[PDB]
Structure formats: structure tokens, C-alpha cells
Design a protein around this ligand. Structure first.
Ligand code: UC1
Lengths: 404, 525
């Protein structure tokens, strides 16, 4: 065929990312996988004259006994030239009742990759205990997970989807990297069939389900407003916890007043000493309570800014997240309810999927876990075909107190 | 022969153009002899004045012979040569290997010199042999093979060796080869002769591509001293470790010792360097002599005995499970040993890493578990079953309430004191009929009591902890403490049991003593 010349952002060089240690199981998997991709020429072994490197992982397919090879092309995509016709984000997707995700990465393996770019796709299969060189490869076809691949296949893609799109324009179809987000409002039963049909309508040209194969439901997604304790009697402690949370939240909703509540806190009373609430204080709480019933006004999403996400471990298998771009200016806030890591990763993928669906981009996460732990286990529970960017942090015991 | 690896200089750079230093008529003669032999062997080729490049060359006589050796300085070319994929930067840790009936190391003579160089790159490898008599000008050459001393030689060689070795490896899965620079290590479970036989097939296969190696007569035999180890076909150990009997020790001596002592830890259980390390405090020069403390000589002496008796780690049996066992060797000190057969140690080790100024044993033991896990995946590609001196109840209680996410593989509680526990827990709700202290350096209570102590040399954060300390100090067996310091709060809410700060340890002390403690935060002004 004809390969479309791709270039790195000006002046930039290729990635030389370290490969994180893999378990024999995952290593055995990747070997099996790559050996066949080689026979079929999707990949080729490389020489020492290639200094670049990208991390590969093996993850499980949900409801499939097969392994998926996952290449962390995050640094590569970052150094890859932007693309200059786009298929913008259908705001209509978030509203749809049901949405299913399909892995269409196999499509890319039918398009050749510009011979001069191939070197940058180098990745390595590590060897246990370094007893062997480590199998080195590079791509010849468009690789799954590279930002270029969807772009370069856009044409060939719109083509195969014009018929279903007009023969079924009640369905919204969004593509993001290796994923295809199919949305509708049909009955969950109708949905599954219209879906299956697109599967073969795709098989016709040359898609196992994603996110448990399972369903999604963007209509039922809502913000987790800041809440206050609604209790019988109010003790001194209760009130301090109250004022503290209030004060904190005042920075967002400046309409919150604490004056009357802070007045019940005069004197050095016994923390357990119950305090009946005055009339003024009673109205004050109520007003504050009204103000919090909804997300602060004025917060709009800026396509030119990063989408940030923070997660908090609440306990009992419960987490709290917030997606914003500017401090205190949340675009969204949510909740999520095995082991700590498994949960967290399911949550991350969940929040990412939402970001994609709502804005069409992945968030930059802040996780409450040590790097080595994450690096160690994330691939054991991961199922997405994309990888959000992430960093690690030390959650301040107060912020957690202020959520959920 | 071997497929050439295409090479290029770094973008926007030209080949080396550096003058040949002046040489002795003696050294010129030497080089010419050496270079002619090389040309006769095809390693290099005379070139025309068409080539503007040049890399210096000089003559050296290595330690033992009145014969001459040739050296070419490629510093410049190397600064100009493209980067390559890293040569094996990772190496096999002995405990990772599987034992073999026979092991054999094959030194690969004239490694690089047996591998062609990218035609298009040879031109940059140009050097010159000055002429003895002036009006009669010098010999120009370029390399045809991997130049010893060149940037890509190691990588390109490793690379080639692998392709060469592949076939053989396939026709001989019953054989294991570890490439390492110029040596080639080969193990098998073949009977002695059977093994010594294949060793000879190999050599042939290598010789097939010109690569030469030492004969059975002249080969190096196990144990293999490699990277500070002593490798036997069935067991391993760190090479020999002898401790000095000096009566006068300098910071430097002590540093070397602790360092060697550190090394040993991966195999000699119970080595301790805490007391030695202490000797380095306040030191002013590498040559400063520090006198040993009663406690430091005990340690040295104790270690000396440990090292006297050799120990040997066994190899990895991929058919059996991995068990990791961890013990608290002291505050901040943890020891572990990974074995498959009871006490049949593959490896052992310590852990002192204190992550954060404050911590508790549950947090640290957990981190220990992570370090071990990371280590294992690197060596055996799987995680070991853990034998831990902590009860799930304890673990779960801490886990469940800590803000950070954490996860420990499959572990089994082991009643091997000391057992790790939480020396205390903050009440989840304010305590009734327990006095309430409002601290800000001083406190005020619901019962009228107060103390406004004024500290000196104290930091802003350190003053906060003091108040709390005061409150704790003076209060009864149950206290309610109210602070506005989000710092102190986090510290204590983390429930440390050990700290670098004395102050913090004093409080912890108070905390362990109390019956119930409820700590709460409130906004300042
Ligand atoms: C790292 C190194 C010097 C290895 C050679 O020494 C030995 C290695 C093994 N066992 C293995 S699995 C083996 C044999 C060749 O290469 C490997 C990786 C056993 C005993 C010794 Cl003495």
C-alpha cells in the first residue's frame, strides 16, 4: 500500500522509556503473541542500531481467556506530531442512555506504518533475571495505542461507517484510540442486537466487547455534591467538624456563612457537650445546605487545558474522585464502591472512560498509592486499551473528611 | 558471515578530524608491523587521500611483553556516534539460576575483530601511521571490523553473538548459555562427558564464524568468580570476606567495612552495621581516627564470627514455590530470607528504608513486602508466598483505615516474635467525661486548667507538637485534644510508632500509655 509519512514534533527525538519488570506469565504471553505477529509481519526484530524503547504489558481480556498485549505508547504519543478534518466530540454521547465499547485495534494491523517512523515504536520483551538479551522488536503496521494510528486510519474508518451511520443515525459512534464508543437510547435488549449487527458490519470489512464486553450508561451519571451531617442533636465536636468543612467549602461557594455556627463555639466547652441550635444558626446551616445542593456556577471546560483527576480512599471499598482543570473548579465529582489496588484501577479506568465519553480526552490522575505498588499490580487488573497519565500523592486527611 | 548493522553519526555531525600525535620512529615501526598484519587479515584497509577523517593512534606495551600493542583513541568518534540499544545493563543474580550438572565458561578471543562494520561507516574509522622520514608521508587506514574501543562495538557484538547462538540454542534446548561481554557461560545437566562434548560442538559452531575460544585444557572452571560472587554448579556464595584486626580505625576504613558488611547481608543473615555506622557521626576527615565503642566492637566481633563460617545459597528450583519470611531485627530493621525448602535459602536480606520521617511497623513491614516483591519479580518472575509476623486482624485494621491504597500478596501469619502490632489507636469519636484540651505553646481545658509554656529555638511546626505533648502530658487516662495544626493531625492520625524527631517519640510514648485519645482539628482564626 502507500504509507503516510509521520514525524515527531519538531526537534524531538524518540522515546527511551525503561521497561518495568514482568512476571514470567506475562512474559510468556507476550512472547507467544509477538512470535505470531512476527510471522504475519506486523512486527520485526530490531538491531542495536535502535536505541529507543517503549514498555509492553500483558493484560487480560474481560470474558476471553486470551491475553491482550498493551504497549505504553504514552511518551511516544507525546512526542508525536499533532494532526492537521477531525471527528469532534459528540456532546450527544454523554446524554445517551446506553453505550457499549468495542476494541477495534485489530483494524490498524492492515495499514503499513511509514518506514522512517518505525524505529520509534521499539519495545522490548524482558527476560527473567536478565539471563537473555531481551527480544527487541518494532512495528511495521500502525500499532494499537499510538495516537497516529486512529488518525491515519480515519479515512478508511469513516468509510466503513457511513452506511451504519445513516442506516442507523439513532446511534452515536465515537472513536478514541483503539476504542469505539457506540451509544443509543434503545432498550438494553435492542441495544445489544443493533450492536452485534455492527460487529458483523465490521467483520464484513475485516471487535470483542470492552469494559467487561459490558454495558455503560452515561445518562445515569451525576455529580456527588458536598454534603453535610443531618443529625438529631448537635454536640460541640459535631459543630467544629461542621464549621471546618464549611469554611473549606466557602472557598468554592462564597455564600456560605459560619458566623452563627461559630458563635455556638464560643468558650472552651466539653467536646461531648450537646449544643441546641439558635434560630439564626438554624437558618444559616439551612442556607449553606441549599447552596451546596448543586455544582458551583461558572465552571466550563477548556479544550486547551489538562483534565485532572484526584482520588481519595474513603474506606470499606469506597472512593471519591473529582475531575477539574483548575483548583476548586470541578467539572465533575463522583463516587466509586477484592483489594485496594484492584479497586483503584477499576476506578481509574471508570473515570477515564467517563472523561473520554464526556470530553473526549483522558484525565491526568493523582493516585493515593506508592509507585512500586502500582507498577507492580496495575496490569493485573487493568482492562482498558489506553493508559491515562498518572502521578503519586499523599492525601491530606482533611480533604477526605471533606468528601462523601 | 554476519549481517552488518547499519550505523550513523549523530544528526548534523561530521566524522572525526583530529591530528595524529607525533610518534617515535620506534613506535612508528611497531604500528606499521601491527597494521600490516591487520590488513593481511582484512580487519583494515589502506585508503586514498580521499578520506578527510582521522582518529589518533599510539603504541603501548602492556604489562608483560617487549612487544607492541596498538591503541586508537575513539573518544571523538564516540562523541559523534549514534546511541545504541544498551548492552546488557541488567545481570543475573545468582539466586535466580537453576543448578546445572556442568558449567563451562568460554572466553571469546578476538571478539570485535570477528565482526564486520557498516561499510558506509568505515570511512569515519580512519587513522594514520606517520612516516618516519619527512619528505616521505604516512599510511592511511580505515576499519573493516568492530574497532575495539569504539562505541557500538559491545552492543553490535552482543547482538551478533545472539544471532549466531540462536540456531544452536534451538538444536540444544537442553543447554543454557549466558552471554557476558567476552565470556560465554554454558550449563547443562548432561553427564560430564556428554556436557564436555557439547562444549566442543559449540566451539566448532562459534569457530564456524571465526570466533575462537579456550580449549578444555585452558578453560576456566567453576566455581566462577563473577561480579563479587562464587558460582558453583550447585551452589553460590559471595566470594571470600575477611574482616581486619586493626586497633586504629579511620572514617575511611569504617566506611569500607560497613560497605563490605552491607554486601554480605544478601546472604549472611544477621549482619549488623548499626553500631559501626554510628562511628561516622560528626566525622571531619576521611583519615580521622575514631575509637570503637564497647557496642561497636561487639558488633564487629559478632559479624566476624558470622563471616568465619561460610554459607552457600542454593539455586532456584522452578518446579517449587517461593517462600519469603520476614522478621523485625530492631526498630527500622527488617530481615528476610527467601527459600523453597525450609531454610534452604536462595537469598536473604535486610530492609531499613524508612519512607517518611514518621512511620509504624505495619507501614514499614508492608513496604518491606513491596521491596521483596519487586526484587522477586526481577529474579524469578513470580512473587513469593509470605510468612509474616503480623495478624490479618491487625493488618486489616490498619489497612482499612489508612488513606493510601495498599496491597499484600498471599501471606501467612507466623508466630515468630517479635509480633508487629499497633501500639495504640485514636478514638473515632470524642470521649465522654474525658477532659478537653484546646492547644495553640499552651493549652486551656474545659476544666479550667492551663499552661502557657514558652519554648526557645522552636520551629513553627515543632511548637504545635509541643502543645499537644503538654496536653497529653498533663491529662488523665482519657483525653480529648483539639488543635488547629493540620500538620500535627496528619502525623498522629497516621499513628506512627517510630520517628526521627524526639518530640514525636515522646508523644507516641504518651499515646501508648493513654486509654483512649480523641484528636480533632479546627480552623484557626
Ligand atoms: C551468571 C553466570 C556467571 C552464570 C554461569 O554460572 C552458573 C550458571 C548456572 N545455571 C544457569 S540457569 C545457567 C548456565 C549458563 O547460563 C545460565 C544462566 C548454574 C551454575 C553456574 Cl556455576
Amino acid at each position: 500500500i502507500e504509507t503516510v509519512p509521520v514525524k515527531l514534533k519538531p526537534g524531538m527525538d524518540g522515546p527511551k522509556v525503561k521497561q518495568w519488570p514482568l512476571t514470567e506469565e506475562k512474559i510468556k504471553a507476550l512472547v507467544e503473541i509477538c512470535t505470531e505477529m512476527e510471522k504475519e509481519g506486523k512486527i520485526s526484530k530490531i538491531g542495536p542500531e535502535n536505541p529507543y524503547n517503549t514498555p509492553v504489558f500483558a493484560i487480560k481480556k474481560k470474558d476471553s481467556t486470551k491475553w491482550r498485549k498493551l504497549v505504553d505508547f504514552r511518551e511516544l504519543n507525546k512526542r508525536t506530531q499533532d494532526f492537521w478534518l477531525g471527528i469532534p466530540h459528540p456532546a450527544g454521547l454523554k446524554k445517551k442512555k446506553s453505550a457499549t465499547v468495542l476494541d477495534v485495534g485489530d483494524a490498524y494491523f492492515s495499514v503499513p506504518l511509514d518506514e522512517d517512523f518505525r524505529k520509534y515504536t521499539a519495545f522490548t520483551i524482558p527476560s527473567i533475571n536478565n539471563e537473555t538479551p531481551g527480544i527487541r522488536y518494532q512495528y511495521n503496521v500502525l500499532p494499537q495505542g499510538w495516537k497516529g494510528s486512529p488518525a491515519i486510519f480515519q479515512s478508511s474508518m469513516t468509510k466503513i461507517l457511513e452506511p451504519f451511520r445513516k442506516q442507523n443515525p439513532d446511534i452515536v459512534i465515537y472513536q478514541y484510540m483503539d476504542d469505539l464508543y457506540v451509544g443509543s437510547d434503545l432498550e438494553i435488549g435492542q441495544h445489544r442486537t443493533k450492536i452485534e449487527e455492527l460487529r458483523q458490519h465490521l467483520l464484513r470489512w475485516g471487535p470483542p466487547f470492552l469494559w467487561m464486553g459490558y454495558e455503560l450508561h452515561p445518562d445515569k451519571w451525576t455529580v456527588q455534591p458536598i454534603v453535610l451531617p443531618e443529625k438529631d442533636s448537635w454536640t460541640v465536636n459535631d459543630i467544629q467538624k461542621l464549621v471546618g468543612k464549611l469554611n473549606w467549602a466557602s472557598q468554592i461557594y462564597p455564600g456560605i456563612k459560619v458566623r452563627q455556627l461559630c458563635k455556638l463555639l464560643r468558650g472552651t466547652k466539653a467536646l461531648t457537650e450537646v449544643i441546641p441550635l439558635t434560630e439564626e444558626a438554624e437558618l444559616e446551616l439551612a442556607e449553606n445546605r441549599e447552596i451546596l445542593k448543586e455544582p458551583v456556577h461558572g465552571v466550563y471546560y477548556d479544550p486547551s487545558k489538562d483534565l485532572i483527576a484526584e482520588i481519595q480512599k474513603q474506606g470499606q471499598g469506597q472512593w471519591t474522585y473529582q475531575i477539574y482543570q483548575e483548583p476548586f473548579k470541578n467539572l465533575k465529582t463522583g463516587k466509586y464502591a477484592t483489594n485496594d489496588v484492584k479497586q483503584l484501577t477499576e476506578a481509574v479506568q471508570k473515570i477515564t472512560t467517563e472523561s473520554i465519553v464526556i470530553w473526549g480526552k483522558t484525565p491526568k490522575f493523582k493516585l493515593p498509592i506508592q509507585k512500586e505498588t502500582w507498577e507492580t499490580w496495575w496490569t493485573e487488573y487493568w482492562q482498558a486499551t489506553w493508559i491515562p497519565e498518572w502521578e503519586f500523592v499523599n492525601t491530606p486527611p482533611l480533604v477526605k473528611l471533606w468528601y462523601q | 558471515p554476519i549481517e552488518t548493522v547499519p550505523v550513523k553519526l549523530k544528526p548534523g555531525m561530521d566524522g572525526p578530524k583530529v591530528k595524529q600525535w607525533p610518534l617515535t620512529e620506534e613506535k612508528i615501526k611497531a604500528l606499521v608491523e601491527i597494521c600490516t598484519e591487520m590488513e593481511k587479515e582484512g580487519k583494515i584497509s589502506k585508503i586514498g587521500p580521499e578520506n578527510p577523517y582521522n582518529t589518533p593512534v599510539f603504541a603501548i606495551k602492556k604489562k608483560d611483553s617487549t612487544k607492541w600493542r596498538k591503541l586508537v583513541d575513539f573518544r571523538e568518534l564516540n562523541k559523534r556516534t549514534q546511541d545504541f540499544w544498551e548492552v546488557q545493563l541488567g545481570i543475573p543474580h545468582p539466586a535466580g539460576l537453576k543448578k546445572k550438572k556442568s558449567a563451562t565458561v568460554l572466553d571469546v578471543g578476538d571478539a570485535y575483530f570477528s565482526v564486520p562494520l557498516d561499510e558506509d561507516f568505515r570511512k569515519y574509522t580512519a587513522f594514520t601511521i606517520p612516516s618516519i622520514n619527512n619528505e616521505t608521508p604516512g599510511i592511511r587506514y580505515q576499519y573493516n571490523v568492530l574497532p575495539q574501543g569504539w562505541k557500538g562495538s559491545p552492543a553490535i557484538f552482543q547482538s551478533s553473538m545472539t544471532k549466531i547462538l540462536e540456531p544452536f540454542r534451538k538444536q540444544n534446548p537442553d543447554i543454557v548459555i549466558y552471554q557476558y561481554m567476552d565470556d560465554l557461560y554454558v550449563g547443562s545437566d548432561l553427564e560430564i562427558g556428554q556436557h564436555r562434548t557439547k562444549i566442543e560442538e559449540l566451539r566448532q559452531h562459534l569457530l564456524r564464524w571465526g570466533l575462537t575460544t579456550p580449549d578444555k585444557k585452558h578453560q576456566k572452571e567453576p566455581p566462577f568468580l563473577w561480579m563479587g560472587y562464587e558460582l558453583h554448579p550447585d551452589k553460590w556464595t559471595v566470594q571470600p570476606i575477611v574482616l581486619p584486626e586493626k586497633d586504629s580505625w579511620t572514617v575511611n576504613d569504617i566506611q569500607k567495612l560497613v560497605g563490605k558488611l552491607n554486601w554480605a547481608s544478601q546472604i549472611y543473615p544477621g549482619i549488623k552495621v548499626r553500631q559501626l555506622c554510628k562511628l561516622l557521626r560528626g566525622t571531619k576527615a576521611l583519615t580521622e581516627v575514631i575509637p570503637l565503642t564497647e557496642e561497636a566492637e561487639l558488633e564487629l566481633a559478632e559479624n566476624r564470627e558470622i563471616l568465619k563460617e561460610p554459607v552457600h545459597g542454593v539455586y532456584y528450583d522452578p518446579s517449587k514455590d517461593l517462600i519469603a519470611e520476614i522478621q523485625k531485627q530492631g526498630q527500622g530493621q527488617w530481615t528476610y530470607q527467601i527459600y523453597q525448602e525450609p531454610f534452604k535459602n536462595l537469598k536473604t536480606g535486610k530492609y531499613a528504608r524508612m519512607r517518611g520521617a514518621h512511620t509504624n511497623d505495619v507501614k514499614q513491614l508492608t513496604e518491606a513486602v513491596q521491596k521483596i516483591t519487586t526484587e522477586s519479580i526481577v529474579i524469578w518472575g513470580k512473587t513469593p508466598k509470605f510468612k509474616l509476623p503480623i495478624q490479618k486482624e491487625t493488618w486489616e485494621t490498619w489497612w482499612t483505615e489508612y488513606w493510601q491504597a495498599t496491597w499484600i500478596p498471599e501471606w501467612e501469619f507466623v508466630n515468630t516474635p517479635p509480633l508487629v502490632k499497633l501500639w495504640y489507636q485514636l478514638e473515632k469519636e470524642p470521649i465522654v467525661g474525658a477532659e478537653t484540651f484546646y492547644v495553640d505553646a499552651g493549652y486551656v481545658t474545659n476544666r479550667g486548667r492551663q499552661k502557657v509554656v514558652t519554648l526557645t529555638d522552636t520551629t513553627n511546626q515543632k511548637t504545635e507538637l509541643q502543645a499537644i505533648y503538654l496536653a497529653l502530658q498533663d491529662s488523665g487516662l482519657e483525653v480529648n485534644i483539639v488543635t488547629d495544626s493540620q500538620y500535627a493531625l496528619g502525623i498522629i492520625q497516621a499513628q506512627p510508632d517510630q520517628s526521627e524527631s524526639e518530640l514525636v517519640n515522646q508523644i507516641i510514648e504518651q499515646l501508648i500509655k493513654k486509654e483512649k485519645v480523641y484528636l480533632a482539628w479546627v480552623p484557626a482564626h
